[PDB]
Every structure is written in structure tokens, then in C-alpha cells.
Design a protein around this ligand. Structure first.
Ligand SMILES: O=C1C=C[C@H](Cc2ccc(-c3ccccc3)cc2[N+](=O)[O-])O1
Length: 268
């Protein structure tokens, strides 16, 4: 493939028009989809890619100005879609990737037939009329910990994000992918994500959105899902899952994958 496909570790599995693109969240890579993809390959052409700055990607390619906001990531996504001659896709977006997909669909709604979000949020920071999950002081202690001692921060953060049992295979995997990130890049992407505010553009979305989340998610209070549902400008549905964790498609696939598959496979 071309430089931008190689740079993002693009995998394409299968052929056909019916296509699904899967974007991962901060701290992991395309391997977060390992339990979902086996259920998709028989009906869809499956596109996987890593966000720039993931531990699987070349740090020389991490342009701190390009990725200073979410639009830098949406331009990457669009470029991959165009490079792959993809005319229309179902986009499954995990965590920040949910809003990267929303951004891309504002510029190219023709490219997306629907967006399935998992663990999405347009705004993490609380204000007097919006519960996001974090007070600004929460963030400060985060950037202070990451900056202080990254490795230690990875070990501590991974079980809280994955949730569930602390001895799990998923906590193992995530702490690894978290730690393979270059500490300055991890920091820079952290700021961009946590300082993001997608709330004001939601009304302009014109693609149907399925809003999925763990009922217990350290980074996404359940009211966020309802906020998204109430302010998105196209049709949308919410389904809160009886699961624990920010990466439930990895950590609790038995209860989580069937829900994701229902929302991929069926329309509103
Ligand atoms: O991107 C996001 C924002 C919130 C959720 C969960 C989350 C993911 C990633 C990170 C993070 C990773 C590496 C370095 C710094 C921060 C932190 C959180 N968090 O605080 O909750 O996803």
C-alpha cells in the first residue's frame, strides 16, 4: 500500500462493497478489535487502522501541530478512505475515534452510512450544566502524573480504564500498548483529547449514530450517552451495556460483542 496506509498499519480483510471501518481509542491500537472482527469478515470488507501516535506507529510521523486538535485525525481517516477507494462505510469508533468519525462525517457525510460509537464522549470536563466525568483539577493531576513518571502512570491507569478484574488479560494488554507510546506523544494526545469540545457541532451531524457504552466506565458517565442522544442532529439510538470498562469489546466480549453486532447489522 501507499505511505499513508503503511504509516497507519492499514489492514483490509475481504472484498465487496459492504465495508466496515474500525477506529480505536487512546492507548490501544487496532488489536482492540480482535474479538469483534471474526464476526464481521464473512459479511463485510473489514478495514483496520491505527491512529498516528499509537505505540505501533512511527514516532517520526507524529506531527505535533497536525494532531493539536481532533481534525488532524479526521483528515487522516478521510485520506485512508479515499486511498482505499471506499465510497461508503459503516464506521465503528471507539472512544476518541467516535468523535474523529463524527468530525470526518461533517466534512464528508457521503462517506458514512452510519456511525457506531463505543465509549464515546464529546466533552470530559464538567461545567455547571454538564457532567463529563472530570473536574479540571482531575486532569491536572493526570498530566502531572504522566509527566512525572509515565511508566508508573501506565501501570496504575490500565486496570482502572479496563475495569473488571485487575489480573485480567485485557489489563495486561492495555498497560503494554499504553506503555509502548512515546511519553511526550502520550502527553500531547492526552491534552488534545481532554481539552476537546465536540458538544457544539453535534447538531450538525447528518449520519445516524448508535451510542454504546459500558454502564460502568471511568471516563464516560451514563448521562454523556443521553447528552449525545439528545443533541446529535440525525437519528440516534442509545444502548447502555451491562459491562464494566472503557474497552469492553476487548475485556468483556461475551456480553459486549453481541450488542455491537446488533447495532452494526441493523438500522434504526
Ligand atoms: O481519550 C480518552 C479520554 C478519556 C478516555 C479514557 C482515557 C483514555 C486515555 C487516557 C490517556 C492515555 C495516555 C496518556 C494520557 C491519557 C486517559 C483517559 N482517562 O483519563 O480517562 O478516553
Amino acid at each position: 500500500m501507499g505511505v499513508v496506509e503503511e504509516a497507519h498499519n492499514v489492514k483490509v480483510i475481504g472484498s465487496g462493497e459492504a465495508t466496515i471501518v474500525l477506529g480505536h481509542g487512546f492507548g490501544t491500537d487496532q488489536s482492540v478489535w480482535k474479538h469483534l472482527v471474526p464476526h464481521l469478515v464473512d459479511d463485510y470488507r473489514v478495514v483496520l487502522y491505527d491512529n498516528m501516535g499509537a505505540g505501533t506507529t512511527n514516532p517520526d510521523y507524529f506531527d505535533f501541530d497536525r494532531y493539536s486538535n481532533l481534525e488532524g485525525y479526521s483528515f487522516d481517516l478521510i485520506a485512508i478512505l479515499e486511498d482505499l477507494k471506499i465510497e461508503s462505510c459503516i464506521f465503528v469508533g471507539h472512544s476518541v475515534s467516535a468523535m474523529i468519525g463524527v468530525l470526518a462525517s461533517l466534512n464528508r457525510p457521503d462517506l458514512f452510512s452510519k456511525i457506531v460509537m463505543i465509549s464515546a464522549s464529546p466533552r470530559y470536563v464538567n461545567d455547571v450544566d454538564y457532567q463529563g466525568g472530570f473536574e479540571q483539577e482531575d486532569l491536572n493531576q493526570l498530566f502531572e502524573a504522566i509527566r512525572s513518571n509515565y511508566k508508573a502512570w501506565c501501570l496504575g491507569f490500565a486496570p482502572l480504564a479496563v475495569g473488571g478484574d485487575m489480573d485480567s488479560i485485557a489489563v495486561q494488554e492495555f498497560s503494554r500498548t499504553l506503555f509502548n507510546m512515546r511519553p511526550d506523544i502520550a502527553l500531547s494526545v492526552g491534552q488534545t483529547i481532554f481539552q476537546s469540545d465536540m458538544r457544539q457541532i453535534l447538531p450538525f451531524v447528518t449520519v445516524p449514530c448508535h451510542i454504546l457504552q459500558s454502564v460502568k466506565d471511568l471516563a464516560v458517565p451514563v448521562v454523556v450517552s443521553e447528552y449525545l442522544h439528545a443533541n446529535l442532529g440525525c437519528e440516534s439510538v442509545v444502548e447502555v451495556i451491562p459491562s464494566d470498562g472503557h474497552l469492553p469489546q476487548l475485556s468483556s466480549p461475551d456480553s459486549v460483542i453481541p450488542v455491537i453486532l446488533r447495532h452494526i447489522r441493523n438500522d434504526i
